[PDB]
Design a protein around this ligand. Sequence first.
Ligand SMILES: Nc1ncnc2c1ncn2[C@@H]1O[C@H](COP(=O)(O)OP(=O)(O)OC[C@H]2O[C@@H](O)[C@H](O)[C@@H]2O)[C@@H](O)[C@H]1O
Ligand SMILES: Nc1ncnc2c1ncn2[C@@H]1O[C@H](COP(=O)(O)OP(=O)(O)OC[C@H]2O[C@@H](O)[C@H](O)[C@@H]2O)[C@@H](O)[C@H]1O
Ligand SMILES: Nc1ncnc2c1ncn2[C@@H]1O[C@H](COP(=O)(O)OP(=O)(O)OC[C@H]2O[C@@H](O)[C@H](O)[C@@H]2O)[C@@H](O)[C@H]1O
Ligand SMILES: [K+]
Ligand SMILES: [K+]
Ligand SMILES: [K+]
Ligand SMILES: [Mg+2]
Ligand SMILES: [Mg+2]
Ligand SMILES: [Mg+2]
Lengths: 6, 6, 6, 6, 489, 489, 489
Amino acid sequence: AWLFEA
Amino acid sequence: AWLFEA
Amino acid sequence: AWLFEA
Amino acid sequence: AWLFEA
Amino acid sequence: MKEIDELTIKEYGVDSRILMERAGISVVLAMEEELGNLSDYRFLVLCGGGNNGGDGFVVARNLLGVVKDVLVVFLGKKKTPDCEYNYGLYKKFGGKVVEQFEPSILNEFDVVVDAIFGTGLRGEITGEYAEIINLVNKSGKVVVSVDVPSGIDSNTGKVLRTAVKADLTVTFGVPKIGHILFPGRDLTGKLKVANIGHPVHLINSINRYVITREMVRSLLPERPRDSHKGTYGKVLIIAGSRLYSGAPVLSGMGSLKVGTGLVKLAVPFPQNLIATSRFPELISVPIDTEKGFFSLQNLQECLELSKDVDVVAIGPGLGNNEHVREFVNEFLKTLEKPAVIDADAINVLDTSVLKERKSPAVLTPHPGEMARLVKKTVGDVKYNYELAEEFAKENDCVLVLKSATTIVTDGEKTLFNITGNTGLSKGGSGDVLTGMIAGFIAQGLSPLEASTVSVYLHGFAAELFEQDERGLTASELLRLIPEAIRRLK
Amino acid sequence: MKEIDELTIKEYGVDSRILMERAGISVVLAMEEELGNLSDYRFLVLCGGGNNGGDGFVVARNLLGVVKDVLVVFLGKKKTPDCEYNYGLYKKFGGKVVEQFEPSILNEFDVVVDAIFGTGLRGEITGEYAEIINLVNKSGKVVVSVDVPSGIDSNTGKVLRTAVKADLTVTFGVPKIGHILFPGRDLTGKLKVANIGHPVHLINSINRYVITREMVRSLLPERPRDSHKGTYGKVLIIAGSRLYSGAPVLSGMGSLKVGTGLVKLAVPFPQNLIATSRFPELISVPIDTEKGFFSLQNLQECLELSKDVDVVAIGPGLGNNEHVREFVNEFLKTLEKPAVIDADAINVLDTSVLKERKSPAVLTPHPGEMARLVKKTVGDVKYNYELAEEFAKENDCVLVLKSATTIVTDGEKTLFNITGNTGLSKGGSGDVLTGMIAGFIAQGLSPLEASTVSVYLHGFAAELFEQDERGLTASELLRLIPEAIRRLK
Amino acid sequence: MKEIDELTIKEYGVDSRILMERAGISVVLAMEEELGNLSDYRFLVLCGGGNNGGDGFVVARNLLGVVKDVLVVFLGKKKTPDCEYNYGLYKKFGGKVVEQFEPSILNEFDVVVDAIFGTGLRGEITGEYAEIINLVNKSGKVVVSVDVPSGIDSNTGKVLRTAVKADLTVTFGVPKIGHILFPGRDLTGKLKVANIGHPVHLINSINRYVITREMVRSLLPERPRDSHKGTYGKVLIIAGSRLYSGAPVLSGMGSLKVGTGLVKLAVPFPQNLIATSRFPELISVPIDTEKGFFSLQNLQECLELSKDVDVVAIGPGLGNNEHVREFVNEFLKTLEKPAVIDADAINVLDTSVLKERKSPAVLTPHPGEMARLVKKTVGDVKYNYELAEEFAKENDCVLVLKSATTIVTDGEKTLFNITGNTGLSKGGSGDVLTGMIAGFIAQGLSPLEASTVSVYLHGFAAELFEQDERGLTASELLRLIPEAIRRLK
Ligand SMILES: Nc1ncnc2c1ncn2[C@@H]1O[C@H](COP(=O)(O)OP(=O)(O)OC[C@H]2O[C@@H](O)[C@H](O)[C@@H]2O)[C@@H](O)[C@H]1O
Ligand SMILES: Nc1ncnc2c1ncn2[C@@H]1O[C@H](COP(=O)(O)OP(=O)(O)OC[C@H]2O[C@@H](O)[C@H](O)[C@@H]2O)[C@@H](O)[C@H]1O
Ligand SMILES: Nc1ncnc2c1ncn2[C@@H]1O[C@H](COP(=O)(O)OP(=O)(O)OC[C@H]2O[C@@H](O)[C@H](O)[C@@H]2O)[C@@H](O)[C@H]1O
Ligand SMILES: [K+]
Ligand SMILES: [K+]
Ligand SMILES: [K+]
Ligand SMILES: [Mg+2]
Ligand SMILES: [Mg+2]
Ligand SMILES: [Mg+2]
């Protein structure tokens, strides 16, 4: 979750 | 596949 | 068995 | 592998 | 295929004996794949005097030393050069031939290889030929037919007095029409098509094909994500009467289940209300009729409704009286949209109307309707693909002649469908197929492509029914269509 | 987002090079997550002269020494400071750049990283830019686009002459409108949104959002155990005609399946009986009409029926003639309840009526209906969120502009829905959505919240269909709604 | 690594702030991988005034808005430029710093990020620094150390008065010696090595490595199918005495289990019979001795036995008296084969003999034996890799200094082994390792390669013991070696 949102 | 088709 | 032996 | 080695 | 053999030998230069060797070994490999290890079986090889028999001698010679017992019964009088050559090999290899048999000969064998007649069959089978074939058929042994079961006419599928019933048929190059049409299709049992070394270009040039899963897959239209119902076409179904209120609903849902965007029914009032009580997705326009049947008084309303659609299906449940006949023919004469013409619209059709139409048409008769349409007997038209081709060509249409094997033709190209089962032998299944074809035309497939995809998917859906096929109904068939589509890809 | 970058640099003090480094590494991590171990792939990095290209140089430099091969094709003329700086690093690290390419260059590479143009795209792509993009698109290689696929306008989703088709797009901070609207949404492939170090407060301040599962989850109303049907509201649906008897049933069940307590239909007699024959849970009030369509003669009965409900939906299947127009407009002028206005009620709507209504409204046009409503072309209104916002603001309503990506706006806040598939591209699906919105308003959600939850759930239900999407029908969609709701929590 | 940072900044041109940003984010990603979703944890970030602290400020800033709570305790006086810059960012982002703490501050936090001291640690930790570190260590919170746990000297692994005990340490570029040697290795907890953007060429140039599975895998010799025992070498083991009859058996099987073709023991009679009663595969030559110990009277027989082998191992269980000393030194002076010198052969070794040998040698002391060999204390030699390197270089040998982390060096190249567990802390395990090294030399590996593969495999075999490690014995260790080998490939 910290780096990417889908 | 080379010899037979069904 | 008819065509190949291993 | 790109970011971390263990 | 006879031209294909001749060209492969005479122009490409493949020795006829090489083709025959390849034929025979392909039968051995096929049998191994079907029976497992062959070394414990005893084989009875029945050889005619032709090249079918020659194929049989290759089979027999190749089993020598490797199985428990081989015997050839040679039933011919004379032998062709390649049969004689291969008989010669069988015998140099230590093979036993006999030229007579006793009814009891089947006793000491487990597998019968049927190399009596192939594509060279001419006329009825009688005499010793018939009696050995009837003995084989009573024997309960495993039967493997070389090329075509002996006694099937390979151009028609008809039984010439008597024929072998095979568990396995191994054919060479391409399936023959007689493995595809009944009764031949039934006697063929499981069909394997062997590559025996013909140039692929020759095999691919054959003009009459079986509809396969891969063909249907590549015809299914695309579903681009940025789309809306208009992307997927609009169908009008003109159908039903006070007698036949169910047909419109089955045709309409048939169109929806194959992915059509909008489907409208025109059905006599109040029978139109039946459709939306079952499926409220459908639009079911009430048509005011004098006596519960379409007539000329509804011509103008139907042409109006037709202006806003891509295809019109007409006929299921219309009834057949003179007022329906007048309406159907004036409508089709004036309609400038593709038409799918079924059922009672076929029964009242004036075929002169088809010739003068500039727009395309698909006709979907069962043999009773085709017989009435061309003024012949059911027996003369059933499985008569050449008659279907002539009709399609002369009337500038696609003809879909329904039966256990369905023929789809535009007069140039002819396709055979072999999906389905006897659950479709029940009222309503035809009405579904009509909607399916209209639906695929609306989505942009040619009438021929639409018919090809629909007959395949319609039969495949029937096969996906979970319980006994005889209990399948049209409503259940509809529910299975989207599963058929998913399995296709 | 351009303001967001500028503020992060100029006021928060984050070096622009740090943002660019973070951008580039996030692309490497994204590719690893998608492709697995990168060490066996060969990478072709296509870099423009802008900051998109600068991001690309960071990608390339970070793959040096760790993958099988990297090559940069630099296609720009000049370089921005950060692009130049990162080009400089790539080269000090031992990187190979070339400034020309041969159609064959794609040969020796497995992955193309597309860093040609991002948000800086202006005007049509031509020349070498276009030709390399068309070569990439024909190459069948894996394509990873930096920020936005080059050639998509990131504010509209439109293709500026030609555009890259990506397998994976990695965007920074927030999704751009051009990943959300088509065709851009299609070319984006799989979208990953990377955090590159913007203050979260700036990211959260963006005024146009994608509707997510978490947002919809927190909007779903509560179901307290001590409740009864009145807890969950009452809907009146004014819908149907003698031509369109199905629409009311689909709208009514749409309200029931989202948890509404009581749903009443007003439908012309006898078409009202259709609804309860299918779903006897529905109340379907017969309206006496002269010719099968609502008219002023039914105004008083409908206002009466409206007094006892929390919301009224109007329009599906009403037909569009002058008597319907007179009825719809006088009704809405007098109705002092929230109104959900759809379909033919939109086609006959006098927008002056909307302005004078004190009660709220949601309008639910597809682009054809929106085009007719504002007297523009379908092409001018389709995906035109600024036009939707203006309309919503000027008419004091919520506008739900339906399409593969649906826009939901009240003029201030705008939400984009990306659930659904092409099974909804079929008559009836709209009628279901109308009932859903009315239903959620009845349960106490604002018109905007109701519309937000409903468009998400309506599309998600379609995705839960078990067979091929093209066979989905509205009736099946209804059955899937409660499963969509369960999956949401 | 300090030179590596300087070169990356000053010559390659990477902004020091970019390296620091990369450091900090790699800590966030590492923590996420270890703790799962970070959004529910509260973080206490302890920052010194140096660049370790600057890394810490990047960590803290990047958690802002995304986790439940962050607080920085800044414990330094002054700040380096990059620490100050990143402190500045943390604060512009809305971060809370405090410069004092109460013992109770650990109360309201779940995770402690230790960014107090990294490689810049100099001298003992005292004062507030010590007290916060002792509070952290008593707190039972999850501890994540930036680069090295604060208080470990990163060049030696020694604790400078007090040190942080971490659950997770994230280090940059390469592991430091202080994560590899104890006590530092113990305080490091789980070590992740993050790539922060150094040119790979610089990272790869580091001259002191951890022995990895991949390195050992690529060193394992080939087993070509057309081979025989001579392909795989011959070992002579000169070992044992009337006091120590077991050592020869463990060394001999150690050679056999790593794939050596023929192994011969020379052991005083009757103790030689012990070996073949246990393992009849071994050849165990009886040596006639006066009193049960090797002496000069056996010199000639041992040189004779040595002529037909590829390597000689000597020392396990020999005993240490003057006659053994005379024998061992005259033997090694005359032996012109690689020698593996262990145990009592080390205790009596005259190091002048090593210098004059033209043939190679590997010495395998534990720290007690190394201490006696160079006339220093156990404390001075334990983990003293620079002393090991000097000794190896001056005596032209490979030195294998055994301990929980084993050092393998030839004076130029130094490798650290981290496989194994405390089941090897028991008599006999050393004797096995001696045989393993001799075995691999016999199969054609260099003395350094042989030692590298053997220390890894010897420790890995111990880890494969199925029950509690403290019950592992040398005999069981032997049985596990071929499983260790299989797992390596
Ligand atoms: N054994 C079978 N195997 C495979 N397919 C079959 C089988 N039996 C029938 N079918 C298929 O089922 C469909 C039946 O279509 P129709 O013969 O038109 O039958 P039906 O649905 O009863 O027709 C409905 C009505 O319309 C008019 O033809 C007539 O008034 C009839 O009552 C065709 O596609 C046909 O190929
Ligand atoms: N490819 C797609 N992907 C996702 N969603 C889609 C897609 N295609 C359609 N949808 C959704 O399906 C719904 C279709 O709504 P309508 O366009 O109103 O279609 P429909 O149900 O056919 O309308 C019924 C009737 O009412 C009047 O508009 C008109 O008389 C029409 O016949 C919308 O929510 C739309 O976003
Ligand atoms: N905690 C540990 N973790 C990992 N490895 C360990 C650990 N403890 C011991 N080892 C390993 O076990 C082996 C022990 O070797 P030695 O110290 O030589 O111990 P040992 O087998 O008892 O020696 C046998 C005999 O020979 C002479 O040294 C002396 O006479 C001794 O009694 C070495 O490889 C060492 O690295
Ligand atoms: K035959
Ligand atoms: K791009
Ligand atoms: K630290
Ligand atoms: Mg029919
Ligand atoms: Mg609609
Ligand atoms: Mg020892």
